Symmetry: C3
Amino acid sequence: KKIHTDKAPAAIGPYVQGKIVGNLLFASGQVPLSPETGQVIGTTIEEQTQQVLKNISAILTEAGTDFDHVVKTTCFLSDIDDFVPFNEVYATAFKSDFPARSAVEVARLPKDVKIEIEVIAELI
Amino acid sequence: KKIHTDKAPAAIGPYVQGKIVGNLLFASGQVPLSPETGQVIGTTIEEQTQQVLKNISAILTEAGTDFDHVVKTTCFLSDIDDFVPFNEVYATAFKSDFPARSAVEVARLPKDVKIEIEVIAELI
Amino acid sequence: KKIHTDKAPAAIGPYVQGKIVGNLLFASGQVPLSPETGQVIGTTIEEQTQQVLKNISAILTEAGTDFDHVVKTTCFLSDIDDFVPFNEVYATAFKSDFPARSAVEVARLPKDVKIEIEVIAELI
């Protein structure tokens, strides 16, 4: 069972936005792309993370879950040095019950954005 | 329970090719190695991805699942400029049913291969 | 349910050390930090891997599982050429029932450490 919403960038190619197995939602890595203009939103890790989170949120909602039910994320950064500012904006979506996390510096990301996040979540 | 198949490269030392928990298969990242010669097959992203996918296929079969029942993949490229041909070959293992995906360039993979793909798949 | 133990590095901020969902513990990736001092432990891939493994131990223990019941790990190395020494240390924790694995070289890790391991595990 699959996720489609026009409130996050559309799956163009051989994947979906996310997919559900039992109570678990596995989302595709989200990037700082606008679901409206398809452009990269923002020029800073701060702006870009906010976009990524907007995009994740849309996916959780359409799946009938929420930020507070994310059990685990993997954060991909282009520059581990962004980590502090990155963290401040991450924390605006997850404020209370926190997910388990890994955060590493990869070499490149689609479009050389600064941040890509994937999330795994429990259904409400 | 573990998974072993002669049709994917042999698991040497402290891992297995795949492990099942409840209804879920967590397969190890597959590289374009020949289960029969123990060597890297292919000189292009195209050939290499082909072998990765065979390797993965063997494991799913062994595990009582298939590509249509793969829920989430992670595709680690040695070079994101290879993305377009990767994505064309990747598509051919699927039909209308796609998994959630992330795909990133990592700095290096075992034996300097171009592609490594981990899957998580639901058991039929 | 969130996991916390004093015997793994403390969760500074907007993650937790481990999160349970159904029968699954998803632990934050672990680095070679001392829970007592907060510093990097080890200069070699061997000593750092040991520290990581203890941090994992404390978490599995806290959650009421152990190494035998780990389904899948991801090993982020800063240098793939470290693989053999790291594999050997990696072995000392996993006796009989090995998890699936993926191992890739990232550009960079927090604090410029050589190794970070995330684990997924079933509750005894």
